[PDB]
Every structure is written in structure tokens, then in C-alpha cells.
């Protein structure tokens, strides 16, 4: 099926379009094409600095009556320099105004770590360490709950939270809404069995990011593994008469995950949605799972000293 039921009683499309690194002069086209081609979920964030252009696309397709707003599932994230209680609603409203929406279907705390507020997204000290904010995840979550109670967002969630930080929220005193989603990195080199089982056992839907290994990540290094070029993954693809990306997108779908491949290439945007007509076998799934290397696209090492840095813990 195309959607998964969230614990807020809404349905989330299991395939969405990613927008991190999508250039502001190509992302309007990319989102139009995606909607034309069937996508109903767009993954956004203020920190991606292109929400305005994404919004233009959404608006035009609504205007054109290609889609209705209820059919869309639009997701954004609160950036780290806005975890202070007084900053969350305006952060959300900026996103709404940029995307030209009057509500978000899902709004996530982008990272468990709060940073010092200001103009700077990664405020640094004279040793290039990120400057923390004294906020904690629990008060931040309480501020996300108010957005639900004010009608600005239909559901709230988390991203890059480890199982202990998920547990902190579920066990938060006076918790009012549980997280609907945990959005984490997940692909055959970072399979996440443990964190995924934890979350699903609690009725928290997991969204897999960087499902293709983020080949356009800005810090790519030569000896880094490459999913797209992995001969073993290519062989499974060939066996199924599909592309490697198709296998890499279909792979988290069969784990009951949501997946958001990024592309600005219209041929790829199309290709990437054509993943509902074939099935990986259990052997394929276990074989893909066997490629785990605990390799992360996204683990910015200048945050390692943050108290809430999520990746020291095993899972
Ligand atoms: N929560 C967070 O912390 C977080 C972190 C990272 C990512 N995310 C989200 O997850 C989305 C996906 O992750 P990602 O952007 O890191 O990377 P990704 O989706 O794994 O890979 C995107 C790269 O793959 C290429 N590509 C797309 N389809 C392809 C295909 N069929 N064949 C060959 N290459 C293809 C794209 O090229 P072109 O664009 O040139 O076609 C781009 O260079 C992001 O865009 C963002 O929405 C969230
Ligand atoms: O975030 C995006 O979606 C993609 C993303 N990932 N990363 C790697 C990161 N690693 C982190 C680690 C922590 C930490 F929690 F661990 F402290 C906190 C924050 C980050 S950002 C980036 O540095 C980044 C920079 C600009 C725009 C998007 C991103």
C-alpha cells in the first residue's frame, strides 16, 4: 500500500521526495515533476535554504488542480538554533510562510541537539566547536506539542534521536503527544535493525533518509563506500530488471519504513517512484541487510561534545 497509518490517525505516503542539496533554481521544477508523476510527500527543512522555491511548486500544483492540499503530506524540521521555547512557533511559521502552507502534516525536531540562537546555523566557538544551547529535548518537545494544539502542524516527530532519547520523550513527565515519526539515516551500509525495531515496537514510524548513500553529500571522500556502485547491489537489481536506486528505495519500503530519495533530475524523479510493481524476496532483504558497515553520511563530528550528541550510544 502507498501509505502508512501514523499514531495521530493520519496516513503518511511511504515514498517522498527529498530536497536537501536541491538547488533553489532547480527544486521548483523538481517538485512539480514529482507531483505530476505521483509523489504526494515532500521532505523539507528550513536549514536546506530552499523552502521558498519548494513552496512555489506546491502552490502552482494546487492552483492548477493537479492535487488538493489534503492529498499532500508536507514535512519540515525545526533547526537546532531554534530549540528555545520562545523560538519554536516563529521557526514553524517562517517555514509555513516559505512553503506557502497554513499547516504542516509533520514537523520534526531535526536533531536532538540545541545550538546557540542567532543568524548562524552552526554557531562556533574559537576552536570551531559548535556552541550548545542550554535547552533540553523535553522542553523542546513541549513546544512542539503546542504547535499541534494551535493547528499549525497535524503531527510532530523527531529525527536523529537514539533509542535512549526516544525513550526520554516517551517517558517525559506529562507527555501529551507521542512522536509520530523518527527520521533516521538508513541504507544497506547502515541498516539500523535495533533502533528501527525499538521505534516500531512503540508505534513510531521510521523514515529512512539518504537511502542511496547521498552521492552528492558535500564531504564525500574517495575511499567511502558507494551503494550505487556496489556490484552486489547491482546484481540484485539486474536480477529484478530494475535499477540499483529502485532496489535501494524498495528495500526500506519492505521493512515498513518511509523513504525519501532526493533528486532534481526529472528522469530519476520518475524512475524513483516506480518501485511499487516489484518485490525483493526475503533472501534479497537479508542479503542487503548483511552489507551493514555502520557507515554514516550524516554525523557531523564538530558536535561530538554536545551532551545530546546522538551517536556515541550503540543505537
Ligand atoms: N533528517 C536529517 O537529518 C536528514 C539528513 C540527510 C537527508 N535527509 C533527507 O533525506 C533526503 C534523501 O537523502 P540525501 O539527499 O542525503 O541523499 P539520497 O537521496 O540518498 O541521494 C541523493 C543523490 O542521489 C542521486 N540520485 C537520485 N536518484 C538517483 C537515481 N535513480 N540514480 C542515480 N542517482 C540518483 C541524486 O542526484 P540528482 O539530484 O542529481 O538526480 C543525489 O546526488 C534528503 O534530501 C533530505 O530530504 C534528512
Ligand atoms: O541535517 C540534514 O538534514 C542534513 C545535514 N546534515 N549535516 C551533517 C550533520 N550532522 C549533525 C549532527 C548533529 C548532532 F546531533 F549529532 F549533534 C547535529 C546536527 C548535525 S547536521 C550537515 O552538516 C548539514 C549541513 C547543512 C544542511 C544540512 C545538513
From Swiss-Prot:
PROSITE patterns: ALDOKETO_REDUCTASE_1, ALDOKETO_REDUCTASE_2, ALDOKETO_REDUCTASE_3. GO terms for molecular function: aldose reductase (NADPH) activity; all-trans-retinol dehydrogenase (NADP+) activity; allyl-alcohol dehydrogenase activity; electron transfer activity; glyceraldehyde oxidoreductase activity; glycerol dehydrogenase (NADP+) activity; L-glucuronate reductase activity; prostaglandin H2 endoperoxidase reductase activity. InterPro entries: AKR, Aldo/ket_reductase_CS, NADP_OxRdtase_dom, NADP_OxRdtase_dom_sf. One of its GO terms (cellular component) is extracellular exosome. The modification Phosphoserine is found at residue 2. Keywords: Acetylation, Cytoplasm, Lipid metabolism, NADP, Oxidoreductase, Phosphoprotein. GO terms for biological process: C21-steroid hormone biosynthetic process; carbohydrate metabolic process; cellular hyperosmotic salinity response; daunorubicin metabolic process; doxorubicin metabolic process; epithelial cell maturation; fructose biosynthetic process; metanephric collecting duct development. Substrate binds at residue 110. It is an enzyme of class 1 (oxidoreductase). CDD domains: AKR_AKR1B1-19 (cd19107). The record marks 77 as: Lowers pKa of active site Tyr. NADP(+) binds at residues 9-18, 210-272. It catalyses: an alditol + NADP(+) = an aldose + NADPH + H(+); all-trans-retinol + NADP(+) = all-trans-retinal + NADPH + H(+); 9-cis-retinol + NADP(+) = 9-cis-retinal + NADPH + H(+); 13-cis-retinol + NADP(+) = 13-cis-retinal + NADPH + H(+). Its main location: cytoplasm. This is Aldo-keto reductase family 1 member B1. Catalyzes the NADPH-dependent reduction of a wide variety of carbonyl-containing compounds to their corresponding alcohols. Displays enzymatic activity towards endogenous metabolites such as aromatic and aliphatic aldehydes, ketones, monosacharides, bile acids and xenobiotics substrates. Key enzyme in the polyol pathway, catalyzes reduction of glucose to sorbitol during hyperglycemia. Reduces steroids and their derivatives and prostaglandins. Displays low enzymatic activity toward all-trans-retinal, 9-cis-retinal, and 13-cis-retinal. The active site is at 48 (proton donor). It comes from Homo sapiens. Cys-298 may regulate the kinetic and inhibition properties of the enzyme, but does not participate in catalysis. Tolrestat inhibits retinal reduction. The keyword Heme does not apply. It is found in: Cytoplasm. The modification N-acetylalanine is found at residue 1. The gene is AKR1B1. Its EC number is 1.1.1.21, 1.1.1.300, 1.1.1.372, 1.1.1.54. Belongs to the aldo/keto reductase family.
Amino acid at each position: 500500500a502507498s501509505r502508512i497509518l501514523l499514531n495521530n490517525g493520519a496516513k503518511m505516503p511511504i515514498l517522498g521526495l527529498g530536497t536537501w542539496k536541491s538547488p533553489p533554481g532547480q527544486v521548483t521544477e523538481a517538485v512539480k515533476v514529482a507531483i505530476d508523476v505521483g509523489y504526494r510527500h515532500i521532505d523539507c527543512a528550513h536549514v536546506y535554504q530552499n523552502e521558498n522555491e519548494v513552496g512555489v511548486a506546491i502552490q502552482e500544483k494546487l492552483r492548477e488542480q493537479v492535487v488538493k492540499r489534503e492529498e499532500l503530506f508536507i514535512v519540515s524540521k525545526l533547526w537546532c538554533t531554534y530549540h528555545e521555547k520562545g523560538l519554536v512557533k516563529g521557526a514553524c511559521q517562517k517555514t509555513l510562510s516559505d512553503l506557502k502552507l497554513d499547516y504542516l502534516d509533520l514537523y520534526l525536531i531535526h536533531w536532538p541537539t540545541g545550538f546557540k540562537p542567532g543568524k548562524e546555523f552552526f554557531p562556533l566557538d574559537e576552536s570551531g566547536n559548535v556552541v550548545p544551547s542550554d535547552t533540553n529535548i523535553l522542553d523542546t518537545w513541549a513546544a512542539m506539542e503546542e504547535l499541534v494544539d494551535e493547528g499549525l502542524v497535524k503531527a510532530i516527530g523527531i529525527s536523529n534521536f537514539n533509542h535512549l532519547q526516544v525513550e526520554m520523550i516517551l517517558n517525559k513527565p506529562g507527555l501529551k503527544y507521542k512522536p509520530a515519526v523518527n527520521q533516521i539515516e538508513c541504507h544497506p551500509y547502515l541498516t539500523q535493525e535495533k533502533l528501527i525495531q525499538y521505534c516500531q515496537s512503540k508505534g513510531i514510524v521510521v523514515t529512512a533518509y539518504s537511502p542511496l548513500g547521498s552521492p552528492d553529500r558535500p564531504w564525500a571522500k574517495p575511499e567511502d563506500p558507494s551503494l550505487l556502485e556496489d556490484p552486489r547491489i547491482k546484481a540484485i537489481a539486474a536480477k529484478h530488471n530494475k535499477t540499483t536506486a529502485q532496489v535501494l528505495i524498495r528495500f526500506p519500503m519492505q521493512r515498513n519504513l518511509v523513504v525519501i530519495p532526493k533528486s532534481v533530475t526529472p528522469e530519476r524523479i520518475a524512475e524513483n517512484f516506480k518501485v511499487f510493481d516489484f518485490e525483493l524476496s526475503s533472501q534479497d532483504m537479508t542479503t542487503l541487510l548483511s552489507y551493514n558497515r555502520n557507515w554514516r553520511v550524516c554525523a557531523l563530528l564538530r558536535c561530538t561534545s554536545h551532551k545530546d550528541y546522538p551517536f556515541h550510544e550503540e543505537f
